[PDB]
Design a protein around this ligand. Structure first.
Ligand SMILES: *[C@@H]1O[C@H](CO)[C@@H](O[C@@H]2O[C@H](CO)[C@@H](O[C@@H]3O[C@H](CO[C@H]4O[C@H](CO[C@H]5O[C@H](CO)[C@@H](O)[C@H](O)[C@@H]5O)[C@@H](O)[C@H](O[C@H]5O[C@H](CO)[C@@H](O)[C@H](O)[C@@H]5O)[C@@H]4O)[C@@H](O)[C@H](O[C@H]4O[C@H](CO)[C@@H](O)[C@H](O)[C@@H]4O)[C@@H]3O)[C@H](O)[C@H]2NC(C)=O)[C@H](O)[C@H]1NC(C)=O
Ligand SMILES: *[C@@H]1O[C@H](CO)[C@@H](O[C@@H]2O[C@H](CO)[C@@H](O[C@@H]3O[C@H](CO[C@H]4O[C@H](CO)[C@@H](O)[C@H](O)[C@@H]4O)[C@@H](O)[C@H](O[C@H]4O[C@H](CO)[C@@H](O)[C@H](O)[C@@H]4O)[C@@H]3O)[C@H](O)[C@H]2NC(C)=O)[C@H](O)[C@H]1NC(C)=O
Ligand code: HEM
Ligand SMILES: C/C=C/C(=O)[C@@H]1C(C)=CCCC1(C)C
Ligand SMILES: [Mg+2]
Length: 335
């Protein structure tokens, strides 16, 4: 009949570097029913047992895993986790698939809500990723070797064979151009516009070993290990400080860009959206997402309503800090 969802964990007691690829967290191959998805971070944590190996977890487990495994900053973990859960998780059972649909999240919610996992396109997951192809081409979750080859190419061209912040600036823009030219349904606004810049620096701030203090750069072996094999590098030590999206500002500055999309189902037809969230208008993202939640849950009652209210509030606690102050919305009132 359902779960009473606890408030998110706070920051880890210990925030220094440590060995995360350790004896208690061995890489293991997928079993039947194991779920993986578009996030290499969560994929790696599942394949090393920081998350349940089946790829279905509670928000709390996801937060603690991103902190333990990678030293993902607490508020960043809260913003990402409850966004993913509100849109893509089962709020009654308190379970989120890090990939596609699975019986493991329990009894489905009332449509149009789906609990279909992070694979679901269009509000969270979106286009112009680094190692995953746009949903328009048929597969938004699998590793794509051609895209990784371009990652390697750009690292060779701008990063001395390593992925660093200069590479990120160039790759991000080029991937936007690929999608403009080839994807008639290309959207790059709202959540996706914001998350697309952060994801390009996560490899630098989080996938680079934490003992490397200076000239942080990711090797292609380590990139392949994580992005393709869902495997931590041997002897991997997490970031020495809580981190998230440091440097995302510089990635945008290298090639200034404006939220929007290809209009009228045509390539090479990018039109700007002036209503979208952007980096100086972050609270729009909060309002947009609360709107999206109302579309998914038009008239909840009982445990569903209760859990919506709590998750919405938990999300806001993170958003309020991360976005520098947003007025809390109460689409379902109070408990
Ligand atoms: C991601 O990874 C990539 C790849 O590793 C990395 O790229 C490095 O980025 C740094 C910058 O952050 C680069 O270093 C800088 O290079 C600048 C450009 O250098 C060229 O021009 C120099 C200036 O020449 C003057 O004089 C000549 C006359 O000789 C004149 O014609 C010119 O017009 C100009 O006026 C030149 O000196 C330099 O050539 C020297 O070095 C090369 C070896 O690379 C050698 O072949 C030459 O014989 C010569 O010895 C080159 O052609 C440069 O301007 C800049 O200099 C500043 O800093 C130094 C030291 O800090 C100061 O002494 C100086 O006053 C300047 O303020 C600096 O050296 C580096 O080259 C990149 N490496 C590669 C491989 O591309 C990214 O940074 C990484 N990103 C992140 C975020 O980490
Ligand atoms: C892994 O991910 C890769 C990269 O995203 C996928 O490959 C892409 O696949 C799409 C769809 O097949 C390709 O899109 C098509 O591009 C054509 C233009 O290609 C030229 O230009 C690009 C660069 O601008 C070059 O890279 C490329 O080699 C060519 O020289 C267009 O003509 C196509 O458009 C037609 O159809 C659309 C849709 O209906 C219409 O709207 C158009 O008007 C038009 O008629 C189309 O967009 C794309 O080029 C591929 N990129 C690369 C780099 O290969 C893989 O599919 C995927 N791998 C697997 C197995 O999943
Ligand atoms: C905290 C909860 C997390 C959630 C809910 C989450 C969710 C997602 C989703 C949905 C995507 C797909 C992006 C898209 O196609 O638009 C994504 C991509 C990504 N995530 Fe995560 N993520 C989380 C944590 C992390 C962590 C801790 C890291 C790094 C350790 C990470 C690294 C990445 C990277 C690099 C990508 C880009 C993949 C690519 O474009 O090839 N994420 N994440
Ligand atoms: C998976 C990525 C999440 C993000 O980039 C977050 C959002 C949604 C906005 C501000 C930055 C950050 C908290 C990292
Ligand atoms: Mg994507």
């Amino acid at each position: 009949q359902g779960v009473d969802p606890p408030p998110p964990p706070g920051p880890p007691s210990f925030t220094g570097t440590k060995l995360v690829n350790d004896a208690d967290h061995p890489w293991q191959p997928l079993r039947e029913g194991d779920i993986r998805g578009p996030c290499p971070g969560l994929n790696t944590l599942a394949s090393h047992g920081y998350l349940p190996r089946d790829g279905v977890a509670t928000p709390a487990q996801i937060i603690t895993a991103t902190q333990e495994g990678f030293n993902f900053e607490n508020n960043a973990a809260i913003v990402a986790t409850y966004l993913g859960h509100l849109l893509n998780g089962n709020l009654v059972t308190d379970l989120l698939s890090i990939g596609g649909a699975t019986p493991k999240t329990g009894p489905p919610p009332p449509p149009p809500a789906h609990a279909g996992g992070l694979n679901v396109h269009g509000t969270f997951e979106g286009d112009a990723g680094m190692t995953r192809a746009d949903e328009f081409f048929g597969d938004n979750h699998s590793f794509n070797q051609t895209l990784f080859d371009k990652f390697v190419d750009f690292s060779n061209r701008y990063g001395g064979g390593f992925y660093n912040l200069t590479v990120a600036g160039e790759l991000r823009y080029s991937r936007i151009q690929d999608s403009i030219a080839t994807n008639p349904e290309f959207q790059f606004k709202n959540v996706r516009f914001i998350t697309a810049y952060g994801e390009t620096v996560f490899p630098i701030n989080l996938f680079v070993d934490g003992r490397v203090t200076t000239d942080r750069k990711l090797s292609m072996e380590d990139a392949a290990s994580i992005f393709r094999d869902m495997r931590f590098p041997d002897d991997f030590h997490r970031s020495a400080v809580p981190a998230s999206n440091e440097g995302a500002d510089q990635v945008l500055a290298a090639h200034p860009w404006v939220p929007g999309g290809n209009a009228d189902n045509q390539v090479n037809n990018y039109v700007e959206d002036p209503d979208s969230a952007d980096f100086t208008h972050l609270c729009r993202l909060y309002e947009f997402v609360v709107g999206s939640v109302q579309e998914l849950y038009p008239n909840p009652t009982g445990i569903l309503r209760r859990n919506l209210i709590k998750n919405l509030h938990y999300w806001w606690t993170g958003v309020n800090v991360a976005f520098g102050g947003c007025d809390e919305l109460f689409p379902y009132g109070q408990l």
